[PDB]
């Protein structure tokens, strides 16, 4: 099974990790309601609405009635509540889907984000190797798979000792390969230890950011986050 | 009489003009979790803790027990934590208290925003003209009485009609002796224009907005925003 975004970025934020969890809503005025209450914090800011299904490929997915996307930006807490009014008590298209949709009953109101690099990273128990492993690469092209079989090179796999689990030099030797720099190494390598210990401590069967970003803060500074989270368990 | 300052903003924000109330907190653990939860939206951003006192001079005040200043930034939720400690329940000393102090039991939390430039503003009952008056600057002289004495040019003065209010071509004139131009024209006329109903409707003596600054969004857009705001009123 999978749990949902929002949850799965609570999770991570619950053992160190920085991710945009924003706020669940269950229905368009609430989803309002908190877009209007963080512009008592940044005001002007531009808003996310990201539909809480379990299923990917939401961005690009379609709704039964005709929006097209489950991840849509917003300029005022007006169109946070258009946006979420259609996707809330209605059906997600996506590719994962198929034909049959998906119902969505909730959604994530966050704030629209100043995205300098977006990364992959997952964490599973590689059967063939017999150890857990941390994959992550720096493409842009969306399908894991699909880089992975046209640049093999553009995939890092770090096996990780089934005991011990990832040490520091595992873990500065994958942030310098995905090309990071300055404090975003040490920032990124506790990011990737946090979301080792969920993998672990929570017996999840896979953790998968795509993206897992570089971002701004309001005030500029460079920072990694999790700007979607996925986790799976067995039960 | 004068209102707090998250009173006054959520005041303005009401009419519909742009300010930071951010959230006001009645204990130093309140504060904390503020800043806590706002991580879920922009995680990473730095924060600003507010004394909400009676009295100006905060930013350049000091504590009674040795902290420097009423308006301080953090860059975690538990530096917002060990000011606020300093803070609530305590007695602040600014140029306006004198020795004796005033005594603070709440703070407002805000995020941490990037200031490109400061005006000051205010709206007054001018009895030598027999209507309100708009005042304002693009001087960072601090003393408002200061700068209108060493530059009389630098203030503009715009006279009200009661039975119209603020004009376009009054707030539009306004804006660009002010130094603005593009998008933050109208932005200024539409935030002026709230000011004004404020004062109005509220049978206000004075709206001071000490700062009214140009901001960036988290996305960098510039946008007018009240960053202080002083309302009074005659009891
Ligand atoms: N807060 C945000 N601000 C701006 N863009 C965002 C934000 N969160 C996500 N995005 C963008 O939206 C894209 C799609 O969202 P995502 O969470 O990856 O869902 P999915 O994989 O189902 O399409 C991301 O790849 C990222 O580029
Ligand atoms: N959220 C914020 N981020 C950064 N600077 C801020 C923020 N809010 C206010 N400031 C700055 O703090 C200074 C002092 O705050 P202010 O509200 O004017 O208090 P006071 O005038 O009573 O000292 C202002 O001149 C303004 O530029
Ligand atoms: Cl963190
Ligand atoms: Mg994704
Ligand atoms: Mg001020
Ligand atoms: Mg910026």
Redesign the interface.
């Known amino acids: 099974m999978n749990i949902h975004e929002w949850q799965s970025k609570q999770l991570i934020?619950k053992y160190g990790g920085?991710?945009?969890?924003?706020?669940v809503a269950f229905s368009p005025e609430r989803s309002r309601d908190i877009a209007k209450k963080?512009?008592?914090?940044?005001?002007?800011?531009?808003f996310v609405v990201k539909a809480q299904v379990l299923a990917g490929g939401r961005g690009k997915g379609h709704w039964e009635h005709g929006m097209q996307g489950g991840v849509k930006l917003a300029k005022t807490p007006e169109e946070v509540y258009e946006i979420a009014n259609e996707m809330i008590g209605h059906k997600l298209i996506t590719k994962q889907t198929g034909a049959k949709g998906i119902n969505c009953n909730k959604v994530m109101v966050?704030?629209?984000?100043?995205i300098l690099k977006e990364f992959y990273l997952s964490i599973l128990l590689d059967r063939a190797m017999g150890c857990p492993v941390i994959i992550a690469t720096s493409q842009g092209g969306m399908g894991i798979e699909e880089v992975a079989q046209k640049c093999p090179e553009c995939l890092f796999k770090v096996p990780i000792s089934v005991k011990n689990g990832p040490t520091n030099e595992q873990l500065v030797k994958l942030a310098k390969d995905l090309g990071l720099e300055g404090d975003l190494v040490q920032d990124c390598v506790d990011n990737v230890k946090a979301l080792y210990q969920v993998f672990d401590k929570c017996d999840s069967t896979m953790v998968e950011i795509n993206p897992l970003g570089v971002?701004?803060?309001?005030?500029?500074?460079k920072?990694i986050?999790c700007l979607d989270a996925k986790i799976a368990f067995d039960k």
């Open positions: 934020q920085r991710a945009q969890s924003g706020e963080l512009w008592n914090q940044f005001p002007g800011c531009k966050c704030g629209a984000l100043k971002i701004e803060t309001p005030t500029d500074e920072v986050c």
